[PDB]
């Protein structure tokens with residue numbers, strides 16, 4: 027992996043564009059105003075791509091050779107890169123401060139800043155805006171995931187009386203759904219920050235590898251059928267497969283796609299009559315989690331429950347919402363995203379069903395269908411030293427005041443009302459709102475401070 | 490990278506959910522019924538994740554351990570995995586036939602298929618469903634980008650008269666916006682199949698590494714300004730900044746953002762007056778490319794052009810559309826996706842403007858913002874051999890008969906009307922619509938057939 031060619035091409039040409047006599051280029055990152063975001067993931071990109079010796083004779087030469095063909099000219103700054111190579115044995119001469127991983131900071135706040143520690147590397151700061159900006163992703167997943175949690179929390183509480191198994195309500199299916207493998211990892215981790223139910227094994231490694239979990243492994247998973255494992259017995263032997271999968275895994279909790287063919291038959295005939303004996307005989311610690319993924323998450327859950335409440339002994343819980351016997355539960359495989367999640371869950375409430383009966387699972391929406399647009403994650407330059415004297419820089423397009431960028435040296439502070447506040451123009455040095463909450467996490471190619479995935483949990487915690 | 494950990498979790502439990510005595514699991518990939526897709530991406534996946542020795546006692550042991558704690562039990566099949574390590578020196582006993590990379594195959598056709606070559610590894614086929622399925626991305630990005638190419642070609646022709654510069658009308662600005670690093674590589678590579686303008690350096694490397702290019706410039710890019718390189722000069726020195734960039738790159742086409750502060754000032758005054766002499770004196774082979782980046786993408790382009798035509802000598806090309814002097818062009822790099830693209834270009838026409846004047850730029854929408862959902866990319870099983878008996882498998886969910894699944898062995902064919910037709914139930918053997926268009930591309934861990942990015946290009950070509 028070469029960092030020399032891991033940025034947006036035109037930046038390779040920025041070094042010549044900054045005012046002459048520029049010693050410092052201070053840049054920050056924020057989710058311009060989902061009122062609060064989970065800041066998570068920077069630590070990953072810092073260890074995997076930024077720390078250590080990132081420059082090498084071979085990497086400086088590879089760059090030139092490419093940018094030579096790419097730009098049909100030698101625009102590439104081999105001069106400046108080669109400088110970093112010798113002067114600091116390839117380590118990047120930049121400082122990066124940030125809010126502790128997992129922090130839930132409201133929109134408009136400085137989550138992390140990047141600046142060059144060596145005056146000649148005034149071009150490095152923004153060079154890495156790209157590589158570093160891709161954190162918008164894990165942050166977004168992390169945020170959106172955590173928002174879907176509150177929705178399940180709000181409704182589980184005002185329906186069951188508590189939050190048992192909350193952390194296992196949104197299961198990550200999106201492994202096949204993501205754009206790449208690496209993404210599968212990163213995204214899976216921005217979920218395990220809010221729930222422990224994940225099928226995208228990848229996100230786990232990353233965690234143990236870049237964040238470390240003292241707990242017994244990050245997320246988990248129960249065995250489950252897929253369309254191939256049931257359609258393979260032939261449409262006529264669907265029963266044979268259902269009964270083979272609940273028996274093979276009579277052991278632990280098993281999930282079984284019941285919509286291969288008429289989801290409402292499988293529920294009313296196969297599970298509620300033929301294999302009635304393999305359900306009721308089950309353990310509460312290992313129920314048969316019926317799983318449809320046919321059409322319209324709301325109407326199906328309701329009808330599924332309706333059918334099941336009818337072939338099985340339903341009970342009314344402390345709050346009045348109907349509840350299936352401990353050996354029968356349901357998971358919403360398809361159509362679930364932060365928006366529909368809200369529909370289904372409230373749709374159940376109106377229908378008196380308890381959010382207990384059902385646990386959900388989102389694929390693409392959960393790990394894809396996310397953009398740097400959603401939370402307005404942006405990396406803009408606010409401070410710069412031109413000729414020994416700094417100047418507060420920022421952009422303010424006319425056709426868009428929403429795109430005004432902060433100006434000057436920034437600092438994150440807790441306000442007397444408990445919330446946060448991002449101070450600009452260096453005013454954070456007036457000793458006003460306590461200490462800056464951002465922490466130097468990166469300086470001269472060496473991770474100066476990291477958090478464990480267990481810490482990220484505690485930070486991103488709800489309520 | 491351990492292939493034994495690149496699959497949905499439940500699939501780890503799958504091996505024991507198939508009917509007893511199943512020697513063959515054969516599945517297919519299709520873009521369930523964007524009327525035609527570009528099949529691109531399989532070749533990379535095969536090469537980077539499935540080729541060669543993908544199994545090692547170390548990777549089996551790792552999985553074992555991880556999986557054991559994941560499912561809090563050992564449902565992990567090391568016996569069958571261990572089998573492959575021995576029998577075929579860690580090489581996957583599976584065969585994958587597919588359509589030539591770049592193939593613009595309509596919708597509802599079998600693009601690629603998979604099946605285990607060893608009756609012992611019947612379970613293996615689906616295992617890698619996840620791995621393979623992630624191709625929806627490269628397919629989708631190569632497909633969506635191509636569609637946008639059409640909208641561009643369509644109006645460029647009906648406005649300039651030809652298709653010159655077409656392959657540079659959509660510059661990839663999404664490196665900043667993709668979910669991860671590995672994504673930008675894949676994404677950008679799918680874009681480059683349809684255009685040659687990309688700032689996502691990453692993609693090029695992947696091409697030369699997994700597809701190879703004999704061509705000179707597999708991906709081109711000119712120097713450009715970014716907000717930091719301008720705003721750093723201070724609001725009151727935007728002119729100083731503009732005049733500095735045009736000078737540094739007076740010889741080559743240089744793009745320069747102008748919405749730092751008032752896009753309509755930098756155009757009517759900064760470039761139209763204070764620095765006119767620096768634009769009009771430029772080579773056509775190195776124009777100044779004015780680039781707005783905020784405001785209504787259409788309203789802005791028109792006013793931008795309206796200002797420029799009012800400050801520079803505009804001509805009227807044959808077709809009757811207005812055209813700016815050869816040294817002055819516009820690059821619309823914000824808010825451009827297939828929809829808006831189609832609105833702008835269309836809006837430029839009603840307003841008598843040649844698509845020659847503008848060149849677009851998309852990022853988030855181009856590479857990110859696409860889902861396995863869009864083209865209905867799906868991988869399902871359609872044929873299996875149980876007790877030496879082949880059965881045509883399929884799912885036909887009610888409440889969404891649109892998720893139906895083809896049945897039996899498939900083959901791609903070209904119908905006498907020139908288009909394509911996917912044959913099911915093994916009816917392809919009746920040898921009627923010529924030979925199967927699918928070529929075996931992967932046998933027992935060996936790429937038996939790949940295509941140069943030059944061929945893919947020729948396949949994905951338009952008209």
Ligand SMILES: O=C(/C=C/c1cccnc1)NCCCCC1CCN(C(=O)c2ccccc2)CC1
Nearest residue numbers: 197199225248249250281355382383384385499
């Ligand atoms: O194996 C699959 C993966 C399916 C899939 C499908 C498609 C793509 N990719 C993966 N299982 C689905 C997650 C099961 C995890 C837990 C088990 C324990 N559990 C309950 O006991 C329960 C209690 C109350 C309410 C609901 C459930 C909550 C849910």
Ligand SMILES: O=C(/C=C/c1cccnc1)NCCCCC1CCN(C(=O)c2ccccc2)CC1
Nearest residue numbers: 034036662688711713744818820845846847848
């Ligand atoms: O390099 C950037 C990068 C912007 C950016 C933004 C955000 C993030 N990352 C990067 N933007 C401008 C580069 C486009 C270069 C090509 C040169 C050849 N060309 C024309 O000569 C022309 C002919 C006719 C009409 C229009 C143009 C078409 C445009």
